[PDB]
Nucleic acid binder design. Structure first.
Lengths: 60, 206, 143, 145, 55, 80, 70, 141, 67, 63
RNA sequence: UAAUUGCGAUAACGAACGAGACCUUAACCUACUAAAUAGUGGUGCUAGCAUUUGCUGGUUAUCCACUUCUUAGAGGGACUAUCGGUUUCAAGCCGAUGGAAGUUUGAGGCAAUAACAGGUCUGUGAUGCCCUUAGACGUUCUGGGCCGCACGCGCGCUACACUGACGGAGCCAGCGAGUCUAACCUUGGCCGAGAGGUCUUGGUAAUCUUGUGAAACUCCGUCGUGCUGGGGAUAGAGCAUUGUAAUUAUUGCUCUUCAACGAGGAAUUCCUAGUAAGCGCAAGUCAUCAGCUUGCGUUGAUUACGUCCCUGCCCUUUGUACACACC
């Protein structure tokens, strides 16, 4: 939950009304043991605008 | 007491006074009646507890405040004057101390004596501000039993607090004196004084 | 029956162990004791004057024994307390680090603790030994 | 600790460093009423002088008292960390003193009198009888002088 | 300069501490113009034609 | 090459707020009657099969003392 | 300074010969006899407890409690 | 394996998890016995469950309870609830139903939210004051 | 206060009026019925409706109610 | 001292411009068979016990 | 009824905006899907104490198993239910029982029509008009000032101590945030009384800081009612840190100096349950600076559950020569 707390007013006048905006970051990860082609195929397609995909190999 | 024991051990008189009589800190819970008509139903005593601490809720209904164990109704009404708003361990402890002191002097169950300090200082009738146009007068009123309890505790604990201010003795000792003198009225106690005054006025204007 | 230190009530164990390192003599107590203040968040120096280093040492031994590994800073944050900023509100501030560290080394020489990997000090097997021993003792005080 | 007794060897009230110290008060907290020594300095010295903090002021022996006066007006010699001292770097000779009793007054005077004599803004400020450490003056201290 | 500043009297706490507190130091907001708000100073006013033209 | 742009027609201009705001903006900028502009806008928006619509106009028109005007037709909800 | 700060011999004998009849004894009960500051009062309790009269029926700091030997 | 259930008990945010197998009758919290758990003024709060149901009954089971979150009181109440819930869980699974129901009946007939997790929770502060309802302070003029 | 809104009582009315050859004095089956008969965008709304048509169902069993 | 004890048998209302006094009718228990409406101060419910110290004198409207 | 929320009366009948619905969060789930970035049980491997089996730890993967706790996806769950008081036996309200929860479940987000010459041209490269535009009211550079002190007023912070200060010792949270064209969060090892220095390290993060070992608070001492060791103002002297720069003293440190304040006039603010108040964090701001605020958890009371007396505001009735509407 990325919060932001702000006076609703552009100036200083008024009863002190605060407002709280928020942006929500959801993060998933899936572990797959596989060769080369099927991964490249699965990262080429299933593409979604808004959904950010990152494909690591790694073991350390 | 037909002792049981297992791995991680539990002390003797501990096992004893636990499973046997479900008494207080370590004081008799039965016997002890409210030495007055009314006040019963509004002064607890049974079902019994161990220490006057509880995850209770007596504020979510009008009268359910009256079913709380009365000793805890005493301990709660300690922890204030701001610098003690909260701090129930302080309260509970000084309450144990106090009970010990009370029970030391002139014997008796300390809890019983507490009953005798509540029952007495509760004002039987008071007065209220009644208008009648500008220059108001004072109308006497037969105050409820519950408010008699509440006012009893308020008078007792507050008086004990003002009495424990700027003087060598402790809240436990002063409270002890304010329950001892208020066991049976002595007019050398804050509460009995203030109550008697409220009745003096309640009858004077009636 | 056997015993760890998890079978003795802190203040019992630590008082005991304190009187023990006292009764011993092999300690390394830098020298600046009685002139030092243990924490910037503190007013006077320790009332114990003669002692307390034993008390802190025992406290450290006990505490490090409980868990895996713990450095000097954790003991600052631990022994850090409420500083009265005079007329300004209290904030929490850490205690001394030369005191703590020199206690670590003084309980590292006398063999109760050891600079383990991952950093921080690890309770010694001889420390396990002796702590459990005086545990058995202190319990046996109330036989 | 213990139940003591004593005959007539303790004297309540006693005079040293040209100032009077109450006798029926713990030694540490007693020789704090000496303008120059505070609870800390006093404690450390008492510990140094080889005296029991548990003793009252009037309880002590004469030898102890004299040694106390000594240690106090001689810090760096009997080993005291200099940063334990109120007057480090004498701004003239440079040595570290601990100005005691009737002297500390005279020393306040001194430093102030230096400031004003140099005509620095702190001098001008202490001459004006004002707040001197850069505090807001609009709202605070409406009696004072 | 600084020299004047320490020399020149009529300066420092006492000299102010003996003078008198002006009466405008405990007054009021002064206001000036408020109950006038709704009434226009402009004294011009619009015109029903141009209002009927614009809207 | 890291960036590629595609111009694409939007389906039903008469269901996009922004498109309509722009519309009447250029109506009044072409000097059309305020009432006729807003009414024409709401009309076109409604005829595109919208549940409801509204056009508030706040400012000064030829006068000097500013005013405001609501032009709403059909069904709209405001809460939740 | 207002008295009760030391140990004037017959003050100790007062103390020795006054703890009988004391249904309750403590710091705030010791002081109340026109005598003894809290230091020498705590010391008084702890020493008198070594052998005599006062029976320990309570525990810790801030609050002292005793009775009489039977 | 052996007969064993695991339970919990919560107060505010304090969660108290409780392993209860079958053994020689130990009862440990975090790593130390129930004869500690200081506060200690509130010792009998967590003592309570083994006294309500008779001090035996544990001489064929083994309990350990680890506590996280909350303050001190939170954790004490958390672990007593954990232990009570634990015992009744064990009898629900391994002994019989009349006993589980008898222990529930002996608990609830006294209680302090022993099997029932109190749902009291902190309320949000709002802008305008140093509290949840408590507004700041006005002077008008 | 638990004064049921207009939409609730209106719906309940219609439902008792056209499905009395079903239902009962039991909330559960009336709720489930509601799900099998009325398209409601909310669980909460549907439970309010079902509970009220349930109470009405009970109080029709001992006499008539207007509407 | 002839202290009297009477049980709340009904709850009538709230006198006083403030609304703190609770108009309530009570019935004695030592010698029943007679009733008096009285005014309290605190929080009261039916079947509570008021200590009347004025055997014969009742009240009504408060201002 | 919190509600133009309903019931009912009834020349009205049946609706739509707004309230409600809805959305968000805290509550329940041994039921589904799971996980070395979460955790548990067993086994290896290993230390200590007991030794009779045991009790208490270690081992970012030694394996195997699991999903109670942790996490977040889909679901379920409450509809004031069941019974019973009370009222036009209508809406409802009261009480007992059950229940995670029965005060709109607790707290928020949104929220119609209309008004004010409320505030903002010192947020905008939003803008009409006017003024200024080269000795500038443009811009930039140096230095000073917004902090200046007889005094009036408002938000506060710390206190007058013994339900206390001190010193040991016990020791527990939840909301957060953290370094690419950079120096942010920083464990750990040494050095120093301290502040801090220094040598390395993990972490772009459920993985590292961090279990954020926070504070009230608990425990054993010391002091003993005395402007006291309560209280910490004012002030002198010395060490450090941020920064191009700290004098009018950014902040932090150590010694000394030891004020007013002995519960506070008339007046006046806020508050009904994990709420009040007490307690400390994190975040904003931020090179350095919180006695501020936004949130957060910790400890946890007293007193109502009422009314129209003070006040403030709604609603009808009534008057009106007002309608630019009592300014």
């Amino acid at each position: 939950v990325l919060k932001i707390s702000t006076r609703k007013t552009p100036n200083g006048e008024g009863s002190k009304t605060w407002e709280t905006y928020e942006m929500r970051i959801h993060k998933r990860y899936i572990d797959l043991e596989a060769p080369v082609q099927i991964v490249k195929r699965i990262t080429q397609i299933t593409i979604e605008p808004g959904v950010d995909v990152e494909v690591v190999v790694a073991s350390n | 007491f037909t002792p049981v024991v297992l791995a991680t051990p539990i002390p003797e008189e501990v096992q004893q006074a636990q499973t046997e009589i479900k008494l207080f800190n370590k004081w008799s819970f039965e016997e002890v009646e409210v030495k007055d008509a009314s006040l019963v139903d509004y002064v607890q005593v049974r079902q019994p507890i161990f220490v006057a601490h509880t995850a209770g809720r007596y504020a979510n209904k009008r009268f359910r405040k009256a079913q709380c164990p009365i000793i805890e109704r005493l301990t709660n009404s300690l922890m204030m004057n701001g610098r003690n708003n909260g701090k129930k361990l302080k309260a509970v402890r000084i309450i144990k101390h106090t009970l010990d002191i009370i029970n030391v002097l002139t014997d008796q169950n300390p809890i019983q004596v507490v009953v005798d300090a509540i029952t007495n200082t509760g004002p039987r009738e008071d007065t209220t501000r009644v208008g009648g146009g500008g220059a108001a007068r004072r109308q006497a009123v037969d105050v409820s039993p519950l408010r008699r309890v509440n006012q009893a505790i308020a008078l007792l604990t507050i008086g004990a607090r003002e009495a424990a201010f700027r003087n060598i003795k402790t809240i436990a000792e002063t409270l002890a004196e304010e329950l001892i003198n208020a066991a049976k009225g002595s007019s050398t106690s804050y509460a009995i004084k203030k109550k008697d005054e409220l009745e003096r006025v309640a009858k004077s204007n009636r | 029956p056997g015993v760890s230190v998890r079978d003795v009530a802190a203040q019992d164990f630590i008082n005991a162990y304190a009187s023990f390192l006292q009764r011993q003599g092999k300690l390394e107590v830098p020298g600046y004791v009685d002139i030092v203040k243990t924490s910037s968040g503190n007013e006077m120096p320790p009332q114990d004057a003669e002692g307390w280093f034993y008390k802190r040492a025992a406290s450290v031994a006990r505490h490090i024994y409980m868990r895996k590994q713990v450095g000097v800073g954790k003991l600052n944050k631990l022994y850090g307390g409420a500083k009265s900023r005079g007329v300004r509100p209290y904030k929490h501030i850490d205690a001394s680090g030369s005191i703590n560290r020199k206690v670590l080394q003084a309980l590292e020489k006398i063999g109760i603790v050891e600079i383990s990997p991952k950093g921080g000090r690890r309770i010694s097997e001889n420390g396990q030994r002796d702590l459990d021993r005086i545990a058995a003792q202190t319990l046996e005080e109330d036989e | 600790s213990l139940v003591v007794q004593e005959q007539g060897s303790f004297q309540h009230i006693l005079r040293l460093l040209n100032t009077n110290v109450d006798g029926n008060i713990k030694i540490v907290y007693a020789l704090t009423t000496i303008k120059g020594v505070g609870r800390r300095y006093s404690n450390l010295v008492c510990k140094k002088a080889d005296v029991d903090l548990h003793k009252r002021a009037g309880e002590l022996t004469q030898e102890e008292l004299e040694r106390i006066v000594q240690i106090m007006q001689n810090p760096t010699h009997y080993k005291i960390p200099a940063w334990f001292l109120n007057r480090q770097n004498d701004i003239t000779d440079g040595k570290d003193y601990h100005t005691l009793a009737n002297n500390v007054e005279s020393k306040l005077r001194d430093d102030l009198e230096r400031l004003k004599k140099i005509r620095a803004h702190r001098g001008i400020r202490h001459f004006w009888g004002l707040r001197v450490r850069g505090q807001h003056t609009k709202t605070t201290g409406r009696r004072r002088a | 300069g600084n020299e004047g500043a320490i020399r020149d009297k009529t300066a420092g706490r006492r000299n102010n501490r003996s003078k008198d507190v002006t009466d405008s130091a405990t007054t009021k907001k002064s206001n000036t113009r408020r109950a006038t708000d709704r009434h226009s100073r402009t004294g011009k006013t619009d015109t029903k034609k141009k209002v009927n033209q614009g809207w | 090459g890291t960036i590629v742009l595609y111009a694409e027609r939007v389906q039903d201009r008469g269901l996009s707020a922004v498109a309509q705001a722009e519309s009447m903006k250029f109506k009044l900028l072409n000097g059309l009657a305020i009432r006729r502009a807003a009414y024409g806008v709401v009309r076109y928006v409604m005829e595109s099969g919208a549940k409801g619509c509204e056009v508030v106009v706040s400012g000064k028109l030829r006068a000097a003392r500013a005013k405001a005007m609501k032009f709403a037709d059909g069904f709209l909800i405001h809460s939740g | 300074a207002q008295h009760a700060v030391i140990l004037d011999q017959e003050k100790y004998d007062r103390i020795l010969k006054e703890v009988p009849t004391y249904r309750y004894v403590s710091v705030s009960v010791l002081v109340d006899r026109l005598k003894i500051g809290g230091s020498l009062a705590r010391i008084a309790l702890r020493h008198l407890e070594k052998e005599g009269i006062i029976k320990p029926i309570s525990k810790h700091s801030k609050q002292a409690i005793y009775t009489r030997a039977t | 394996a052996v007969p064993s259930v695991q339970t919990f008990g919560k107060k505010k945010s304090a969660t108290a998890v409780a392993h209860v197998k079958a053994g020689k009758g130990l009862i440990k919290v975090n790593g130390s016995p129930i004869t500690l758990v200081e506060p200690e003024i509130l010792r009998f709060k967590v003592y309570e469950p083994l006294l309500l149901v008779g001090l035996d009954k544990f001489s064929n089971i083994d309990i350990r309870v680890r506590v996280t979150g909350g303050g001190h009181v939170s954790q004490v109440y958390a672990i007593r609830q954990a232990i009570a819930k634990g015992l009744v869980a064990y009898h629900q699974k391994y002994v019989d139903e009349q006993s589980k129901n008898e222990l529930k009946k002996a608990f609830t007939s006294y209680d302090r939210t022993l099997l029932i997790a109190d749902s009291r929770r902190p309320e949000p502060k709002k802008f305008g004051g140093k509290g949840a309802r408590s507004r700041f302070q006005k002077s008008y003029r | 206060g638990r004064v049921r809104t207009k939409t609730v009582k209106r719906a309940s009315k219609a439902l008792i009026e056209r499905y009395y050859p079903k239902l009962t004095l039991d909330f559960q089956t009336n709720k489930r019925l509601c799900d099998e008969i009325a398209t409601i965008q909310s669980k909460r709304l549907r439970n309010k409706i079902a509970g009220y048509t349930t109470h009405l169902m009970k109080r029709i069993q001992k006499g008539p109610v207007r509407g | 001292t002839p202290v009297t004890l009477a049980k709340v048998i009904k709850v009538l209302g709230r006198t006083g411009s403030r609304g703190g006094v609770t108009q309530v009718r009570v019935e004695f228990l030592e010698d029943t068979s007679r009733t008096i409406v009285r005014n309290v101060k605190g929080p009261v419910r039916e079947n509570d016990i008021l200590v009347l110290m004025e055997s014969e004198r009742e009240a009504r409207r408060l201002r």
